[PDB]
Design an enzyme around this catalytic site. Structure first.
Site, short mmCIF file in Angstrom:
data_model
loop_
_atom_site.label_atom_id
_atom_site.label_comp_id
_atom_site.label_asym_id
_atom_site.label_seq_id
_atom_site.Cartn_x
_atom_site.Cartn_y
_atom_site.Cartn_z
N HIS A 1 2.24 3.44 1.65
CA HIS A 1 3.23 2.39 1.48
C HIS A 1 4.61 3.00 1.30
O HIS A 1 4.76 4.20 1.03
CB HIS A 1 2.87 1.43 0.33
N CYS B 1 8.53 5.06 -4.79
CA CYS B 1 7.28 5.47 -5.40
C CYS B 1 7.19 6.99 -5.47
O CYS B 1 7.74 7.69 -4.62
CB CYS B 1 6.10 4.93 -4.61
N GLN C 1 -2.35 -4.13 -7.61
CA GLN C 1 -1.85 -5.49 -7.83
C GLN C 1 -2.29 -6.40 -6.69
O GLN C 1 -2.39 -5.99 -5.53
CB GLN C 1 -0.32 -5.51 -7.95
N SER D 1 5.99 -4.63 -8.86
CA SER D 1 6.62 -3.33 -8.72
C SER D 1 7.87 -3.40 -7.85
O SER D 1 8.82 -2.65 -8.08
CB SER D 1 5.61 -2.34 -8.14
N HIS E 1 7.01 -3.96 -0.72
CA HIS E 1 6.25 -2.88 -0.07
C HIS E 1 6.19 -3.10 1.43
O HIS E 1 6.09 -4.23 1.90
CB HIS E 1 4.79 -2.87 -0.56
O1 LIG Z 1 -0.79 -1.56 -10.97
C1 LIG Z 1 0.12 -1.12 -10.04
C2 LIG Z 1 1.12 -0.23 -10.42
C3 LIG Z 1 1.99 0.15 -9.42
N1 LIG Z 1 1.90 -0.30 -8.16
C4 LIG Z 1 0.90 -1.16 -7.90
C5 LIG Z 1 0.77 -1.70 -6.48
F1 LIG Z 1 -0.45 -2.18 -6.25
F2 LIG Z 1 1.63 -2.68 -6.26
F3 LIG Z 1 1.00 -0.76 -5.57
N2 LIG Z 1 0.01 -1.58 -8.80
#
Ligand code: A1EHL
Ligand code: A1EHL
Length: 147
Positions: A43, A97, A115, A138, A141
């Site tokens: 991502h 990220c 998530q 977050s 994406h």
């Molecule tokens: O729990 C979390 C923490 C950070 N990023 C994510 C996701 F799925 F959005 F990439 N989930």
């Protein structure tokens, strides 16, 4: 009729029919072709001022608005689809990220770990396919399913 989450739509500028997926936010011209325990994804994350942690390796204090973050995401999608840039290149340079240093790769995962909007999009993508903008706490994406 169509694989999970697809509907027919009409282009406002050309009038030509296209297909839209409301789980991945992908859109394409051609009729879509058509679940595993695990998938592997990369991502590219663009954070904004309302992200859970408005900080990344690129910026100590992330101040851009959500709207500004969506505009950046849309621009990256355009360049990936045109072939002007590679997904991996843009993820390494601009993803908010830590996974940027691994060309965005997150490895393999099951349902339950990510998530929910990220997880649903990841599992609805076919191998090789890219998402449209996906919203989570977050940030926003672009998701690439690699396995
Ligand atoms: O729990 C979390 C923490 C950070 N990023 C994510 C996701 F799925 F959005 F990439 N989930
Ligand atoms: O699973 C893990 C653990 C540590 N770092 C990474 C990443 F994203 F940077 F490659 N992935």
């Amino acid at each position: 009729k169509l694989p999970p989450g697809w509907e027919k739509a009409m282009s406002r500028s050309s009038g030509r029919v296209y297909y839209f997926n409301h789980i991945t936010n992908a859109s394409q011209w051609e009729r879509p072709s058509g679940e595993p325990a695990r998938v592997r994804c990369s991502h590219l994350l663009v954070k904004h001022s309302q992200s859970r942690r408005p900080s990344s390796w690129r910026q100590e204090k992330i101040t851009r608005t959500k709207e500004e973050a969506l505009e950046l995401i849309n621009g990256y999608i355009q360049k990936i689809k045109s072939g002007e840039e590679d997904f991996e290149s843009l993820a390494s340079q601009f993803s908010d990220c830590s996974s940027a240093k691994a060309r965005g790769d997150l490895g393999a995962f099951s349902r339950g770990q990510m998530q929910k909007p990220f997880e649903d999009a990841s599992f609805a993508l076919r191998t090789g396919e890219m998402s449209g903008p996906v919203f989570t706490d977050s940030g926003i994406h672009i998701i690439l399913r690699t396995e």
